[PDB]
Amino acid sequence: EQIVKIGHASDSVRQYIDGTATSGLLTDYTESARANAVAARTMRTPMLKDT
């Protein structure tokens, strides 16, 4: 619930506005978040804590 609350706010304030030259200050956040999510998609359980 908290994650989607932050996500919808951050998405909205991106798609809110574009621009003709000064838009290069902004990131296209949602696509960068998708890029970050697929990078974080590789994860593994740790081994050797005991045996």
Partner 1 sequence: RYGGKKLERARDLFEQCLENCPPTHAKYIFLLYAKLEEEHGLARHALSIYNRACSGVDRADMHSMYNIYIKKVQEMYGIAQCRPIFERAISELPEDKSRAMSLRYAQLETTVGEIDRARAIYAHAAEISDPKVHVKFWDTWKN
Partner 2 sequence: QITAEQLLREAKEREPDELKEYQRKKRKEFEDGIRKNRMQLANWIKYGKWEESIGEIQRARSVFERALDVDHRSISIWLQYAEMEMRCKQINHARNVFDRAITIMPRAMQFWLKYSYMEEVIENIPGARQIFERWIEWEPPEQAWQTYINFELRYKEIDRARSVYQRFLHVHGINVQNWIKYAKFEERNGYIGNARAAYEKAMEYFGEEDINETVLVAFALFEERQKEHERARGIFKYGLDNLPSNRTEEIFKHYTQHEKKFGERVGIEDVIISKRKTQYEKMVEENGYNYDAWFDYLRLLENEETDREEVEDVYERAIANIPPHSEKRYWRRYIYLWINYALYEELVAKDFDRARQVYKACIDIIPHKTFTFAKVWIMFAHFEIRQLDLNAARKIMGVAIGKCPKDKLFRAYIDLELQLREFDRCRKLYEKFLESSPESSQTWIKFAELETLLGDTDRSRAVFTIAVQQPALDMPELLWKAYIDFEIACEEHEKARDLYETLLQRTNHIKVWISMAEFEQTIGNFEGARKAFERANQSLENAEKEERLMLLEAWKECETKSGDQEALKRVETM
Partner 3 sequence: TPAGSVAATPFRDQMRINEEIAGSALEQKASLKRALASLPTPKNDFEVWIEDASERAE
* C-beta separation of 28 from 11 below 8 A: no
DSSP summary character for residue 17: -
Encoded one letter per residue, x for contact with partner 3 by CB under 8 A and - for no contact, window 15-34 reads ----------x-x-x--xx-
Among 7, 15, 23, 31, interactor with partner 3 by CB under 8 A = 7
Q: What residues contact residue 29 under an 8 Å CB cut-off, 6+ apart?
A: 10, 11, 14
CB of 20 to partner 3, least distance (A): 19
Point out which residues bind partner 1 (CB under 8 A). 41, 43, 45
